[PDB]
Amino acid sequence: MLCEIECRALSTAHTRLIHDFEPRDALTYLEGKNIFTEDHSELISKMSTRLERIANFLRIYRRQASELGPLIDFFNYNNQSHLADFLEDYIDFAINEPDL
Amino acid sequence: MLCEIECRALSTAHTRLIHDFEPRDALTYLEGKNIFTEDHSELISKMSTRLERIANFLRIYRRQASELGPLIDFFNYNNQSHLADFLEDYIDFAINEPDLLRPVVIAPQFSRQMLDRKLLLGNVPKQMTCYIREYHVDRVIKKLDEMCDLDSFFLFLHGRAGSGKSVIASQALSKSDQLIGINYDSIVWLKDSGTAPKSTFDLFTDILLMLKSEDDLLNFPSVEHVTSVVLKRMICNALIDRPNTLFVFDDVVQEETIRWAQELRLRCLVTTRDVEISNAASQTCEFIEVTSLEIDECYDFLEAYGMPMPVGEKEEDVLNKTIELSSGNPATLMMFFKSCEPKTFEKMAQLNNKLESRGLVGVECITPYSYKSLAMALQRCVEVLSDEDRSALAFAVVMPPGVDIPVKLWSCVIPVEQLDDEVADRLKRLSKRGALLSGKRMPVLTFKIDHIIHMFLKHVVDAQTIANGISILEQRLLEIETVIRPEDFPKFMQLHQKFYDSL
Amino acid sequence: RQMLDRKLLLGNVPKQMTCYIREYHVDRVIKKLDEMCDLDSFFLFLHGRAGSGKSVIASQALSKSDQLIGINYDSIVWLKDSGTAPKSTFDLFTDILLMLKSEDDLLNFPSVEHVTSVVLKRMICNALIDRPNTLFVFDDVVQEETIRWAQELRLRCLVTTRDVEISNAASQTCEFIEVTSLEIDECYDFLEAYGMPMPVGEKEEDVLNKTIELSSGNPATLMMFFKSCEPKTFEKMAQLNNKLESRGLVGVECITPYSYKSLAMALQRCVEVLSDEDRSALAFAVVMPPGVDIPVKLWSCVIPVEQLDDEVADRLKRLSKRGALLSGKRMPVLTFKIDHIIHMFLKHVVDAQTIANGISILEQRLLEIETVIRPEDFPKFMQLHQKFYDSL
Ligand SMILES: Nc1ncnc2c1ncn2[C@@H]1O[C@H](COP(=O)(O)OP(=O)(O)OP(=O)(O)O)[C@@H](O)[C@H]1O
Ligand SMILES: Nc1ncnc2c1ncn2[C@@H]1O[C@H](COP(=O)(O)OP(=O)(O)OP(=O)(O)O)[C@@H](O)[C@H]1O
Ligand SMILES: [Mg+2]
Ligand SMILES: [Mg+2]
């Protein structure tokens, strides 16, 4: 599981993950880095609208990964680096400082 | 407290919160996250049945929390995550992606049986399964769908008396599965018919009780004695647990109800005869008029109720006589059928006579109408009339029904310088208020009185005042088809000698 | 923006009107309320003529910004007064206490109907303890005692009223905002807002300057006007402009969001309340030409009562202070003025005799021995207004 910091990030950067993103794009990269299951990708891969595939990707994801690595290491490769940069910036303004 | 969205969710996801859940499980988690008290948990914790602990948890909760957060967390931790997931899905299809809530998270929730349950409890009557006025029931439902978004609004289903308005609301809330469940959560249908000044308060006494839980109808107090400011405050309070609740106000006569409906920020369907009650509301008022049944619709309506359709030419005419007399009126048409037992074209024509020599009383019968005959209804429409307007109407008997006729030709019989537009002003109020007359702007300002609206006055005004108005006309006679009567030829109302000699 | 509506509804605040929102006023109301959320108790007087629109503005001033409710004040209590009886000032505060009462224990509501004033007052605040920053709109005060109670109860009050002097009851500082007659430009805006056709020709605008002159910027009667123009054509708009001269306000009386069929039903009261002697002064003003700035002495002629008639002026001030029936002006010279809405009513209401008697009573003193006021060399002839005098 993640936590409040790592899940607060997927939520804060949500206005953005709706305008440009797609869970189908990440399913192959995650069935791979060992964070999904062939029913998981089925469940998120057959969804009529994208806000469905997105809400299931963000629900399913928060349970499966030991951390928020294999999703920064993806928006990079997917030409959606303006995303993986925002999230890595957010994880840093908490990892390198003890005050909020 | 929450709001209509957050409370509509606790209500939509209610079929579920009953099958698996328990308020005892959440009390500890909520005394904690700072929402309830040690009496709160006492009140919900000692309850014999769970539907009690549930209805108190959902009542008490909607008041206490600044938002719908902690509940999701609770459902998640409690291994009831199939719940906190449904509610978080619902809260998301509102803020970010609008519209999608009804097609996706609301439509599957539709349930006709629930509609019954919901219809019955909202005191909605049965609809006319036999004949359905296509056009109207449809357009009603449409304009209601357009507004479930709106926070408060008036829909005026206004028409003649017995013109069939109330039946259409029965059908418009009974056809689709959308209006109840999808667009609005609950229904409250209350018949007004208030004339006294205490009536507009008494109405809203029975709304509050239409709202109040099955529990505490026992505790119902002598609310009979308590100010208007309090019944009003008392309602809009018990109205928090009424998300997306619709209000049918079958038969409003007093514009004071409309004023209360707008102080109470209600969502209202309104059947009425007098349309001007809407001037009471400074607001989104939208209107649908129940017209006289078109000539083709009359046929459909007859066939639908086993009525024999014409063949010979003076048989379609026997039936055009009924349609002309009834002038496309649902209620008196129905009284006709119940009273044409023989069904013969013959006994159908017998009645066509009885109607000319006995007015509506010739066909008065036991009918689904609260009224033996349309005259019992119209009685009221006429009492309410401005004292001066009561006069104007009363003299309209002289005019031949079903004829488009000039304002000046009317200025002759109607009571009151040189410009008689005042006649027109009365005649407008007259069509606006029970749709007794009929306004028609060009080619030239002319009105017209139909037959049902006539044989009402025929057997109702002073037998003298008929003959006095006729003479008062023949005096102005001299003075100085698809074609309206010209000003070169008013001197002779004699065209209608036929329809005048029968006095 | 969904919490407000909860708070507005429960504080019995009416619905919000948006079709026409008097910018200036709703703004200035909100402002002067923001300045005071700090204060412990205070009176805000939104005074104006009958149907001048005061009550509507309080509906809007508490409905536009969400600061007033939540940020500046925690809750709202909006109660309509309209009290005339001596039991009314107590009955008001009875409901006030009831309003304080929560939903719980509205069941237990006692026969509080019978209990002293000292106790409803002590009891009210007992409940008030659970109320922080609770504004109290008192829509339509016509009794000073209500204010007196408001100040014994150390309340925070918005107040709509017609008679401004009720504020002399409060020793505490009371700020004021006057709802004036709708300016000529605002009238246009108001008309357009409600589908009313704007002139394309001089005659057209003059037809419309006739309505604005008759209505004299009175929203309530203006509204009654609109509701009564089905054709709406500049033509039927001018038809009515006539009906107004030959039938007074009763020519356009209609079903309106106003509790009143016509402005005459309202003003009725404003006139009953009047000092018995002042009721007299007002009653004779009908003879005077409306929308004309005219000297005190020229008034001393029709008004009842040594050699200094300032007493006339004293009555005429009370007269503008108390329903804003008259107009006040200090220099160039002390002159008052009666508008048309305030006039047509009198024209079609006051004893048909007393009109003609005042006209003659003026002629007796008439002989005596434009952007210009009438000079003392030329009072002998009120004949300038023969036009607006022959129509009697
Ligand atoms: N669609 C319909 N099918 C069958 N009967 C109808 C229909 N519409 C109207 N009627 C007749 O009218 C009677 C009830 O009329 P309805 O209540 O619909 O009119 P209404 O406009 O409500 O009159 P009111 O305003 O007086 O209530 C029924 O008993 C029936 O006789
Ligand atoms: N901003 C506005 N928009 C639309 N109508 C208005 C407005 N202001 C006033 N009115 C008209 O006046 C009526 C109510 O007037 P309002 O209650 O605002 O005046 P008022 O000063 O409260 O009079 P009173 O002191 O007698 O209560 C409304 O029905 C409407 O016809
Ligand atoms: Mg009915
Ligand atoms: Mg008011």
Numbering used by the authors:
A (entry chain H): 1 to 100
B (entry chain A): 1 to 416, 424 to 487, 521 to 543
C (entry chain D): 112 to 416, 424 to 487, 521 to 543
Task: Quote the study that presented this structure, word for word.
In Caenorhabditis elegans (C. elegans), onset of programmed cell death is marked with the activation of CED-3, a process that requires assembly of the CED-4 apoptosome. CED-3 is synthesized as an inactive zymogen; its activation requires association with the CED-4 apoptosome. Here, we report cryo-EM structures of the CED-4 apoptosome and three distinct CED-4/CED-3 complexes that mimic different activation stages for CED-3.
Multiple oligomeric states of the CED-4 apoptosome were observed after global 3D classification. Hexamers, heptamers, and octamers account for 80.5%, 10.3%, and 9.2%, respectively, of total particles. In the reconstructed hexamer, the upper CARDs sit on the periphery of lower CARDs. Group II stacking is likely to be maintained by salt bridges between helix H6 and helix H4 of CED-4a and CED-4b (orange rectangle), in contrast to the multiple interfaces in group I, explaining its moderate local resolutions. In this scenario, we hypothesize that CED-4 hexamers might represent a pre-mature state of the CED-4 apoptosome and contribute to the regulation of CED-3 activation. Most of the CED-4 apoptosome molecules are pre-mature hexamers, which may represent a potential regulatory step.
